[PDB]
Amino acid sequence: DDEEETYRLWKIRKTIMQLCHDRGYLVTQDELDQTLEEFKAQFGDKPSEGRPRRTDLTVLVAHNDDPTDQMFVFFPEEPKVGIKTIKVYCQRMQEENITRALIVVQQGMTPSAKQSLVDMAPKYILEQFLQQELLINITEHELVPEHVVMTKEEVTELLARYKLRENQLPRIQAGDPVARYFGIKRGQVVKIIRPSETAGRYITYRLVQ
DNA sequence: TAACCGCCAAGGGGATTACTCCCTAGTCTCCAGGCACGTGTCAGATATATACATCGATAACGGCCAGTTGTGTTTGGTGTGTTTG
Questions:
Q1: How many angstroms is C1' of B84 away from CA of A37?
Q2: Where in the numbering of this chain does the RNA polymerase subunit H/Rpb5 C-terminal domain appear (predicted)?
Q3: Which residue is nearest to nucleotide B84 (CA to C1')?
């Protein structure tokens, strides 16, 4: 389809922009909530072998406080992305000092690809998202409360306040969709704020592991 | 003084005889005694037989050891599939 594909692309882009904004990267208040009309008028609304073709709508955004830190958002055309594509992406990334990135794959990448992805991990952080997982922004959902990634200093402050070993805090595996959304990694604590029906508000913490 | 011798006397009684009674030695027969067998009995010795006793063998009895409906999960391998080298 044409119209549906354009709608899907616009939704994916909006989701990614909201995600980057949540993480901390600075983004236009315009593109954060741009409707679909300007999207059509910008790209062409002819994804079917036309102007709005993938890999052309990628967006690079720099962090809020560290203008030196950016992250790509690729959109490979291969339904079953291989390793060669990620290989060339990483090579082309290597020219700049960028370290983080985000891959949007049509369909699930082959298992051989995940091995390569993790292999380059310490040097170039890159993670994957299925468009099917990006068509909706979970963090807005009624059930999913509000997360706040904590800085190391305050994590130490918390642990020293409650005299509690970080091993004793609750756990949240990295695979969790909220974790992958925020880009948290192992050994890092996420603050959770829930409306408590018996206490108004209740704040808890979860160490990723 | 009486043993002995002599003359004298009566008659006892010893020997003989004819004759008779009836005794007794002898014979055939057959009893009393005595010493030998014959049958029977009691007592004893030798022998066969039944019974209780010691000892030996089989072996019955005591006793041991032997064999004789359903729901809800996990893991782990095979076949197909895709990508990689």
A1: 44
A2: 136-208
A3: A112
